[PDB]
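Methods — Computational structure assignment.
A single polypeptide chain was analysed. Its primary sequence is given first, followed by the predicted tertiary structure written as structure tokens.
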Amino acid sequence: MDDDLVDAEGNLVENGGTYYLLPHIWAHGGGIETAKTGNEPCPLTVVRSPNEVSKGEPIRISSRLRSAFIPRGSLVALGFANPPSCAASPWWTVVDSPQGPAVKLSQQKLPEKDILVFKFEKVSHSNIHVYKLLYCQHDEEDVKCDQYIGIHRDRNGNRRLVVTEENPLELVLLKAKS
């Protein structure tokens, strides 16, 4: 059977490894990067590449647990293998935004529970492993988390990752190499 996270090539995901977050479509954006938006002195904003031919930034996927893999439904922290030189760390986390809850990097050392707020979900496109991206702090087994990360294109064209009730991300995981 299959019940651990699986990459774009059919191999179990290495817990803590770098896998690119790529799209399930073509001419609609590239991999996932950063962007300096508003008044951040550096790209603290996580957005989708405006370059259809890019794999984006190589992201780290950790369960912050002692497993070689990452079980389905488990929470994970996603973070830049080579993050902006101005963040307390490379891990992503959510903060309130007038565009709704935005995914960003922080100039603050964050307590675990602020970064391990992500979870993947099986899109039923069968033959390749496509996942949606959930944001859950308040977690588990009494209530289902249903806060999907969508995209928000601001006036300056940035495809910002926030929590939207529409056009939610659907991704595939490509293992980064040397």
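Note: The longest strand covers residues 18-23.
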